[PDB]
Amino acid sequence: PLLALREKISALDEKLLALLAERRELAVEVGKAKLLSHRPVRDIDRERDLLERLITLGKAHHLDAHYITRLFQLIIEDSVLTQQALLQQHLNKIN
């Protein structure tokens, strides 16, 4: 009976993976937009808000706040570094 469920889990994980790829593509686009707008990569205000929104909505699914924070902390960290990778490249090229 375990094999049936594990097969569902593996399918779900593949969907998570796809979304994670998509969010990473979005962070690159966002980084591009920051170069034009002359804004820095990191934006603490936005992260503060985003997390509060996620913790509020997570509550409805019974996902706890600390689980959501530990998880989005990795996701945001990754998207921040991805953008910083493009900034550094950019900075070496124009300079």
Ligand X SMILES: O=C(O)[C@@H]1C[C@]2(C(=O)O)C=C[C@@H](O)[C@@H](C2)O1
The answer to the question of whether 42 is labelled as a binding residue is no
What does the block give as tokens for 57?
């909505």
Q: Is 21 in the site for a copy of itself (CB under 8 A)?
A: yes
Q: Is 30 in the site for a copy of itself (CB under 8 A)?
A: yes
54, 3 in Cβ contact below 8 A? no
The answer to the question of whether 47 is labelled as a binding residue is yes
Q: Which stretch binds ligand X (CB under 6 A): 14-22, 46-54, 63-71, 85-93?
A: 46-54
Instruction: Report, in Å, the least distance between residue 46 CB and a copy of itself.
Output: 7
User: How many C-beta neighbours within 10 Å does residue 82 have?
Assistant: 19
Which residue carries 């569902």 as its tokens? Answer: 8
CA distances from 13 to 8, 9, 10, 18 (A): 9, 6, 5, 9
Contact residues for ligand X (CB under 6 A)? 6, 9, 27, 30, 41-43, 46-47, 50, 76, 79-80, 83
